[PDB]
Amino acid sequence: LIEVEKPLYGVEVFVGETAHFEIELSEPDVHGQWKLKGQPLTASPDCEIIEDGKKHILILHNCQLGMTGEVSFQAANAKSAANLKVKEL
């Protein structure tokens, strides 16, 4: 049973830029999963999730307009929720 020493942070992006979401836990050895408003997509060509356990870092690139929601991370018993909005050019 761990918690979230550092929650996420709402960030803006101009479709194409790169969003950033960090969050520290309490115990290493684990694997959560980020999800927009609440949709578990799948790290692909437009998703760059790099986490080494004891730490979790997200890196979304050219984010579309849909991403207009909140980044709620899920892991063991921790749960964060930042704000993210995709603005057009």
Swiss-Prot record:
Pathology linked to this chain's protein: Myopathy, myofibrillar, 9, with early respiratory failure: An autosomal dominant myopathy characterized by adulthood onset of weakness in proximal, distal, axial and respiratory muscles. Pelvic girdle weakness, foot drop and neck weakness are the main symptoms at onset, but ultimately the weakness usually involves the proximal compartment of both upper and lower limbs. Additional features include variable degrees of Achilles tendon contractures, spinal rigidity and muscle hypertrophy. Respiratory involvement often leads to requirement for non-invasive ventilation support.
Say which residues of the entire protein are included here. Answer: 12677 to 12765 of 34350
Task: Spell out the subunit comment.
Answer: Interacts with MYOM1, MYOM2, tropomyosin and myosin. Interacts with actin, primarily via the PEVK domains and with MYPN. Interacts with FHL2, NEB, CRYAB, LMNA/lamin-A and LMNB/lamin-B. Interacts with TCAP/telethonin and/or ANK1 isoform Mu17/ank1.5, via the first two N-terminal immunoglobulin domains. Interacts with TRIM63 and TRIM55, through several domains including immunoglobulin domains 141 and 142. Interacts with ANKRD1, ANKRD2 and ANKRD23, via the region between immunoglobulin domains 77 and 78 and interacts with CAPN3, via immunoglobulin domain 79.
Query: According to its UniProt record, in which tissues is this protein expressed?
Result: Isoforms 3, 7 and 8 are expressed in cardiac muscle. Isoform 4 is expressed in vertebrate skeletal muscle. Isoform 6 is expressed in skeletal muscle (at protein level).
Q: Please explain the role this protein plays, according to its UniProt record.
A: Key component in the assembly and functioning of vertebrate striated muscles. By providing connections at the level of individual microfilaments, it contributes to the fine balance of forces between the two halves of the sarcomere. The size and extensibility of the cross-links are the main determinants of sarcomere extensibility properties of muscle. In non-muscle cells, seems to play a role in chromosome condensation and chromosome segregation during mitosis. Might link the lamina network to chromatin or nuclear actin, or both during interphase.
Per the UniProt record, which residue ranges are transmembrane? none
Q: What is this protein called?
A: Titin
Q: Which domain of life is it from?
A: Eukaryota
Q: Describe the processing and modification events after translation.
A: Autophosphorylated.
Localisation: Cytoplasm; Nucleus
Q: Tell what the record comments on domains.
A: ZIS1 and ZIS5 regions contain multiple SPXR consensus sites for ERK- and CDK-like protein kinases as well as multiple SP motifs. ZIS1 could adopt a closed conformation which would block the TCAP-binding site.
Could you share any additional remarks the record makes about this protein?
A: In some isoforms, after the PEVK repeat region there is a long PEVK duplicated region. On account of this region, it has been very difficult to sequence the whole protein. The length of this region (ranging from 183 to 2174 residues), may be a key elastic element of titin.
Q: Which family does it belong to?
A: Belongs to the protein kinase superfamily. CAMK Ser/Thr protein kinase family.
Q: Which organism is it from?
A: Homo sapiens (Human)
